[model samples]
Target: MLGIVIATHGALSDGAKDAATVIMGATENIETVNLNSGDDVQALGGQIKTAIENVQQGDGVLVMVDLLSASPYNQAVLVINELEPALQKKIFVVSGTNLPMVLEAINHQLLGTPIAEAAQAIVAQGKESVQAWDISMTSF
Candidate 1:
């Protein structure tokens, strides 16, 4: 079974989980790790490593972080780089995760989709899901 970890600043991680639960209607194999307040990059990296390990039992694991250049994302990159090639294949680290990405990921994970396919699906859905709200008074 694949594993997912949602890590973000402050409550963003938990917020993503809430949105994912609403979209997917449940949270079984999904896991969330928030990087806020006292979250150390190195120590939290280890914790994230464990979360990846726990989820990649037979399938794959995807770690989704909120920002790319942020510490959370950087830490994950470092940790995954240290892992062996085989373990690395079972793991994927993605940054700039949104509710759409999370939702697609949860669905893909449950459907037993291949890791590359799942990641591609998430990216595609994430792009298509973006909506530009028209807030101008002329429209209102």
Candidate 2:
């Protein structure tokens, strides 16, 4: 299984995992690294790097960050720069991270699909997961 990393500012990362566990039951080979909003750039990068390193053999890591150009995203980019191009291909880092994105990534990889396919599945789901919800239960 391809490893998954959910990194976000503050406890959002942990909260996402908590929600996932509730919905999908317990899962292994996935890591969540919560970076405090006050963490330094280097510290943030180190946390992400460690999470990536935890990926099992033959399985790449996909990082889902909360926002683009945000601290976590920046740190992820830094980590990307430190890795070789081949390794970078296996590791995916996407912004605007949310439940649909990570869920698709996990489920896609579970089918033994390639990381590129998993990443594409996430992008596709992210685009459609945005929906119009009608919260009006009682029409008076």
Candidate 3:
């Protein structure tokens, strides 16, 4: 199974987990790394590194974070580069993460989705989730 690490700024990681539990009812093989406003991001990067290792079994870990240019994203990038080649190939960092993305990642993990396939699925779900919420197009 692929492990998941939801590392982000502030409580967004927690936000995703809490909501996920509400929908999926309890989660496993997941880790969260949260960063506050004044917290040192380099140290946060270390936490990200730890979370990745903690979740990894045989497959790679899925790292979901904040925006592309955000500190959390860069921190994840920093941590990823420091990892060994074999592990590095497995970890895929997906920024601009939302609740739906988290849910999709967890669901695919539960389904035993391959690391690369899971990463792409999360990205596709994340991108597809963004909508304008048109009142005229409220149909699901």
Candidate 4:
């Protein structure tokens, strides 16, 4: 039952959650936070922290952001830095979030995989998903 937090700009975060929900059915231990236009950094940082705390259930949490060095990722890093070791150790943040990656992570969680293993699987899947899809190519 690993938790998941999707931090992204605009409605992408919400859309990812919706996409996952459609495939996985209603789920617990998963949340999404968005960085809207003109959002206060400190307030958004607190929101991200709260989202992480809300979904965590002893198992670790995976914070997936839309991009590295963006506000969401930076805020996540800030929150993680301030957290006590016990809770901080339970959080892992990765950038380049997408529908496939989140779906794969949730699938791994439902299958009772360890946090590290699940993260690795999600990363691999995310990487693979970035390739070009050829409609008529017969060979790789």
* lDDT to native, each model: 0.80, 0.80, 0.89, 0.89
Worst 10 residues of 3 by lDDT: 131-140
**Cα RMSD to the true fold for all candidates:** 2.1, 2.2, 2.3, 1.9
Candidate 3: regions farther than 4 A off: 135-140
Q: In model 4, what is the error at residue 25, expressed in angstroms?
A: 1.5
lDDT of 1: 0.80
Report the C-alpha lDDT of model 4 over 13-95, residue by residue, as the tens digit: 88998988899899778888989999998998999999999988778899999999989999999999999788888788988
Tens digits of per-residue lDDT, candidate 1, 54-110, equal: 676667788888888888788888888998888787777777788889888888877
Instruction: Return the TM-score for each candidate structure.
Output: 0.88, 0.89, 0.92, 0.92
> Residues 1-140, candidate 3, lDDT per residue (tens digit)?
88999988889899889999999999999999899989988899889999999998888899998888788888888889988898898889998989999999988888888888888888888899998866678776
> Which whole-number lDDT from 0 to 100 does residue 29 have in model 4?
81
In model 2, state the lDDT of residue 126.
Answer: 94
Clashing residue pairs in all predictions, respectively, total 0, 0, 0, 0
Colliding pairs, model 2: none
lDDT of 1 at 86: 80
